[PDB]
Design an enzyme around this catalytic site. Sequence first.
Site, PDB file in Angstrom:
ATOM      1  N   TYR A  27       0.765  -1.239   0.000  1.00  0.00           N
ATOM      2  CA  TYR A  27       0.000   0.000   0.000  1.00  0.00           C
ATOM      3  C   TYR A  27       0.796   1.290   0.000  1.00  0.00           C
ATOM      4  O   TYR A  27       0.198   2.322  -0.264  1.00  0.00           O
ATOM      5  CB  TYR A  27      -0.982  -0.022   1.195  1.00  0.00           C
ATOM      6  CG  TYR A  27      -2.164  -0.921   0.904  1.00  0.00           C
ATOM      7  CD1 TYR A  27      -3.250  -0.454   0.174  1.00  0.00           C
ATOM      8  CD2 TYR A  27      -2.137  -2.279   1.242  1.00  0.00           C
ATOM      9  CE1 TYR A  27      -4.311  -1.291  -0.163  1.00  0.00           C
ATOM     10  CE2 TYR A  27      -3.197  -3.129   0.909  1.00  0.00           C
ATOM     11  CZ  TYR A  27      -4.287  -2.623   0.213  1.00  0.00           C
ATOM     12  OH  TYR A  27      -5.351  -3.424  -0.123  1.00  0.00           O
ATOM     13  N   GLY A  29       2.702   4.524  -1.098  1.00  0.00           N
ATOM     14  CA  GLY A  29       2.761   5.211  -2.391  1.00  0.00           C
ATOM     15  C   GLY A  29       1.415   5.191  -3.076  1.00  0.00           C
ATOM     16  O   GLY A  29       0.416   4.916  -2.431  1.00  0.00           O
ATOM     17  N   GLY A  31      -1.837   4.063  -5.038  1.00  0.00           N
ATOM     18  CA  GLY A  31      -2.574   2.815  -5.212  1.00  0.00           C
ATOM     19  C   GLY A  31      -2.212   1.765  -4.178  1.00  0.00           C
ATOM     20  O   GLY A  31      -1.524   2.039  -3.188  1.00  0.00           O
ATOM     21  N   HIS A  47      -3.859   5.429   5.371  1.00  0.00           N
ATOM     22  CA  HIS A  47      -3.757   6.698   4.644  1.00  0.00           C
ATOM     23  C   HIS A  47      -4.576   6.676   3.332  1.00  0.00           C
ATOM     24  O   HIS A  47      -5.323   7.624   3.047  1.00  0.00           O
ATOM     25  CB  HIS A  47      -2.298   7.056   4.356  1.00  0.00           C
ATOM     26  CG  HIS A  47      -2.158   8.443   3.810  1.00  0.00           C
ATOM     27  ND1 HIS A  47      -1.952   8.674   2.459  1.00  0.00           N
ATOM     28  CD2 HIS A  47      -2.208   9.635   4.454  1.00  0.00           C
ATOM     29  CE1 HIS A  47      -1.866   9.987   2.326  1.00  0.00           C
ATOM     30  NE2 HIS A  47      -1.982  10.607   3.500  1.00  0.00           N
ATOM     31  N   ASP A  48      -4.448   5.593   2.555  1.00  0.00           N
ATOM     32  CA  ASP A  48      -5.209   5.419   1.306  1.00  0.00           C
ATOM     33  C   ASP A  48      -6.723   5.463   1.591  1.00  0.00           C
ATOM     34  O   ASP A  48      -7.452   6.110   0.845  1.00  0.00           O
ATOM     35  CB  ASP A  48      -4.900   4.056   0.678  1.00  0.00           C
ATOM     36  CG  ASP A  48      -3.648   3.958  -0.134  1.00  0.00           C
ATOM     37  OD1 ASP A  48      -2.939   4.978  -0.268  1.00  0.00           O
ATOM     38  OD2 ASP A  48      -3.365   2.853  -0.637  1.00  0.00           O
ATOM     39  N   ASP A  89      -2.625  13.052   6.584  1.00  0.00           N
ATOM     40  CA  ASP A  89      -1.177  13.140   6.405  1.00  0.00           C
ATOM     41  C   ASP A  89      -0.435  13.066   7.745  1.00  0.00           C
ATOM     42  O   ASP A  89       0.530  12.314   7.858  1.00  0.00           O
ATOM     43  CB  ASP A  89      -0.820  14.416   5.643  1.00  0.00           C
ATOM     44  CG  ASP A  89      -1.309  14.432   4.183  1.00  0.00           C
ATOM     45  OD1 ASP A  89      -1.863  13.387   3.711  1.00  0.00           O
ATOM     46  OD2 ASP A  89      -1.075  15.434   3.500  1.00  0.00           O
TER      47      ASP A  89
HETATM   48 NA    NA Z   1      -1.193   3.546  -1.518  1.00  0.00          NA
END
Ligand code: NA
EC number: 3.1.1.4
Lengths: 122, 122, 122, 122
Positions: A27, A29, A31, A47-48, A89
């Site tokens: 996960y 970065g 996508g 975070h995603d 963040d």
């Molecule tokens: Na991600």
Amino acid sequence: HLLQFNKMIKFETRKNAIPFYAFYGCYCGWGGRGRPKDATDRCCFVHDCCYGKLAKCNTKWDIYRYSLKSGYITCGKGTWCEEQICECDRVAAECLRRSLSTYKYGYMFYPDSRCRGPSETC
Amino acid sequence: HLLQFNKMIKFETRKNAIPFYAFYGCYCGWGGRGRPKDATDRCCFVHDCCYGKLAKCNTKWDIYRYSLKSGYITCGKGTWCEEQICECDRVAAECLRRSLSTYKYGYMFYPDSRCRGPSETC
Amino acid sequence: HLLQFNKMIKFETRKNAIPFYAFYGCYCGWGGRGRPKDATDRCCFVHDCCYGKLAKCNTKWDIYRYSLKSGYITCGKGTWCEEQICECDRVAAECLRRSLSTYKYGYMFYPDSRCRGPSETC
Amino acid sequence: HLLQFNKMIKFETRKNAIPFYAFYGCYCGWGGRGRPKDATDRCCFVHDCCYGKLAKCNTKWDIYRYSLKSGYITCGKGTWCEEQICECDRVAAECLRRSLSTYKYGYMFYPDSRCRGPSETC
Ligand code: NA
Ligand SMILES: [Cl-]
Ligand SMILES: [Cl-]
Ligand SMILES: [Cl-]
Ligand SMILES: [Cl-]
Ligand SMILES: [Cl-]
Ligand code: NA
Ligand code: NA
Ligand code: NA
Ligand code: NA
Ligand code: NA
Ligand code: NA
Ligand code: NA
């Protein structure tokens, strides 16, 4: 804005997002799919999910206000979108610092072929 | 960063930079020539001059620290370039607020073809 | 690797990917939805489709070989994945250069809310 | 960049750097102490010394230009740092191929406890 998130990551972990977190596990970065591999990967998964709930916000480029004045990240008061993006963040950067003890250099450039399992629910 | 300067303009003037200031008179927005048409236009001329003294800085895209806490803009601590850019932006946004008494909707989309006077020196 | 793609973008367009292409229109940068807004946006849409055909490749971090020696980007011979990723990147960077005549600064930080139409098929 | 160095090692030795060279002897991979155990280990010792002369360079993560077109690794033109890092990597990959006759599977995951004694000077 993603450059502010990268500054928070560097402030918290002492590592630059590229290369240390941009391709980590399933996960970290842009996508992601399958199951988070460890604590670091789970920060990125959360975070995603956090950004996904903010579909009406410009998560990648909205420039929010934050401060390091107290020796930790504090999100400034602003629009609902600025506060929410900043909070995603901040939480992720602090989570990455807490996960440093289990960070594996072996997961740094993790292949998508090892992330083919069922995708975890947010 | 330009998006932060636009947020300062909105905060101070209560108008969105686009469309109210991005095309105003001879100097508001990118570029400019001739003579500033009024007080609002003069703020933009001074801002262009302010950025002109910062040739070694990434004036348009460097993300600086600032706060709106207590109802006014305060530039935070950072690199020399971040602090200087933030100061240009803060001064211009406050100047635009003070120039509201002479803001003309007729100058909003001012044609650059009407900016034929001698160009003013910084 | 994404940093190589950013170097190709800078070489072809003479603009840095951040801020000029990372948030442009509906498809430039990571992700995308709706209909491409112009020629520049269509390059990014095609690039997303190109990477979409490479699910078995590590499109974000696989470091391929390329040269700028001839004054043009030439992809080196290598693995099927390296060649295919390089080809996606090269085609997109050249497409962005060819689209320069219609590049709009107004599409630079394009909101997702203006990309709500039916998504174009690859 | 480390991933390019690993591609050079595979090209020269026909072995993947992970697992065949990343933990070999006293000096192969990150860090090292004591005395190089053999010719393979000496390549890695020299590579560490080579990187040691490049303290102002981002030795692990700077992406340089190189070619395999001639049937040999050739370093392309770039920044002083890119050229110097590429040269370290090229020399080491060739050295590892030349040391193949004494490669020992018994040294593959060599314990740090056996790398006691005075560390060799660069
Ligand atoms: Na991600
Ligand atoms: Cl990297
Ligand atoms: Cl701020
Ligand atoms: Cl709001
Ligand atoms: Cl930007
Ligand atoms: Cl290359
Ligand atoms: Na990954
Ligand atoms: Na101007
Ligand atoms: Na005008
Ligand atoms: Na967009
Ligand atoms: Na895209
Ligand atoms: Na070493
Ligand atoms: Na070892």
